[PDB]
Amino acid sequence: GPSFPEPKVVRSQGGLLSLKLSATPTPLAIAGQRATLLTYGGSFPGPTLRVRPRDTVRLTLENRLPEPTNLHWHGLPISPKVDDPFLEIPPGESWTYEFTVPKELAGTFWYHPHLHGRVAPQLFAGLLGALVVESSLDAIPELREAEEHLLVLKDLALQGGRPAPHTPMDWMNGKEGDLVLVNGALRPTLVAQKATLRLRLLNASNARYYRLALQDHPLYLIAADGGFLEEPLEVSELLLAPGERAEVLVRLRKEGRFLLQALPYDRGAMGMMDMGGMAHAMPQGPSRPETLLYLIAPKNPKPLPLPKALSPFPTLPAPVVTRRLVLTEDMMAARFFINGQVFDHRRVDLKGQAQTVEVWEVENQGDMDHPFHLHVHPFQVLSVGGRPFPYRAWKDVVNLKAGEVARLLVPLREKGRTVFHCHIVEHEDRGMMGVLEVG
C-alpha cells in the first residue's frame, strides 16, 4: 500500500452488518487552522460500508447534535417506510434502520441528511459517507487483477474555526467553497503499482460541478449511478453533477506524472459586478481550472485487455400514462417552483399504481442548470433535447441545461409515499420539491 489515503471500511460477516454510529462535533486539522466539523463516526468523510446481495443491514443512528436530523439512503430500491423523508430524530435520541439488499443490485451508492429546511447547512458542515455493493462480475480476470480505489469529491470553506455561514447569494446560486478536496485532503499523490486501474467516483458536493479529464489518456466507462453498462464505452472527458456516481477503467502505457483536473464549465450562475464594461458581463461565466490529484505510473507498464461484455439490460412492459413536470425560477427572491407552486408536505401531487410503467417528461424553463432526483424507483433515460442517450443502464439523477426536455421510463415498485426534487440542495430548501403516492 503506497501512501494514498481512503476512508476506513466496515464489512458484513455471516450475512449481517450491524453497527452503532454517532453524529457529533469533532476538531480536525485540514488547511491552516483549528476546525470543528459535524461528522459520522469522528471522520471526514464518514466510514465506507461494504455488502453483498441478500445481506441484512441494521444501522442504529445516535443523534448528538444540537438540532433534529434523519437519513436518506440515496439510490437504494427499498420501502419508503424505512427510507422515510418525513421522520425526525430529536437531540439525545436513537433510531434503528433495517433492510435487505435486493438480489440483482451492483455499484456505488451513499448516505446523508434529509430534514426539510435544514438540508443545505447540515451537508456543507461534513455529514456524508459511501456504500459499495459487490458483484459476481468482479471475479472475471480483467477486473479481479486491476488496482482499485474510491475517490470522494467534495469542497469546503471556513470562518473563525467553523464552517462558513450561508449568505443571501448562496440561497440563489447554491454554495461553493475555495478548498477543493479528494477524500478529505488537498491535492494528494497516488503512486501506482499496476498499469490498469479501476476507479469508483462520487460527487457529494452541495452545488459544484466537475468536468473530469486525465492528461494524455482517455477513460473507459463501465457503470452509471445504479448499475453496469452492457459493454465498455470510450470517452475523452466526463461531466458529473451533484449527486451522480460512475466507475471507469484507465490504461497506463508510458512512464510519467499526470494531472487529473476539473476543466472550465459554465452552469449559469449569476454575478456581482458593478458598472465596468466588457462584452459578456452579468452572468458569472465558466469556472477556473482546478487540480484534483497527481498520478505517477510504474516502471515499464503493460496494461491488461478490456472485458468484452458486462451485463444485459432488461426488457420492460409497455406504459399506461404520461406525466409533464416543468421547472421555473424567481432569482432576486430566491424562490423555485414545479408546475407553478412550492412544496407542501400535506398535499399529494401524483397518484400511481404498483407493478405498472409510466413515461415522465421533465422540462427546464429556467436559465441555470438543474439536476433532477427521484427516491425509491430507479429509471432508464431515453433521450434529451430530442436526440438519443448514448448507453443503456439504471440511473437516479439526470442533468438539464436551459431549455432541455428529458424523456424517462419509470417502473413503479414499492408501495407508499415518497418525494422528487432538485439536488442543488439550496433550491430544495427554498421550494423545488413535490410528493408521489403509490398504491
Ligand SMILES: [Cu+2]
Ligand atoms: Cu442524495
Ligand SMILES: [Cu+2]
Ligand atoms: Cu435547482
